[PDB]
């Protein structure tokens, strides 16, 4: 329609979300927890 500069920030946010999952995975025990890494 006109303006829409959201994809720029959305692309970065997507990468940040992956970090949160990885962080949570390490908190539960990481490799020595039982479940695989969130990648």
Number of helices: 1
- Major sheet size, sense and barrel closure: none
What's the total number of strands?
0
What is the molecular shape?
Answer: rod-shaped
| Global structural class | mainly alpha
Q: Number of domains in the coordinates?
A: 1
Sheet-strand content, in percent, reads under 5%
| Chain oligomer state | monomer
Our Rg estimate from Cα atoms comes to 15 Å
The N- and C-terminal alpha carbons lie at a distance of: 35 Å
Helix content: 40-55%
H and E order: H
Protein name: Exendin-4
Family: Belongs to the glucagon family.
Organism: Heloderma suspectum
Subcellular location: Secreted
Walk me through this protein's architecture:
The chain has one domain (1-29). The protein is built from one helix and no strands. The chain has one helix spanning 7-27. The radius of gyration is 15 Å and the shape is rod-shaped. It is classed as hormone/growth factor. The entry lists the keywords Trp-cage, GLP-1, poly-proII, hydrophobic cluster, hormone-growth factor complex. It forms a monomeric assembly.
């Amino acid at each position: 329609h006109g303006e829409g500069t959201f994809t720029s920030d959305l692309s970065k946010q997507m990468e940040e979300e992956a970090v949160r999952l990885f962080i949570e995975w390490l908190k539960n025990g990481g490799p020595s927890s039982g479940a695989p890494p969130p990648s």
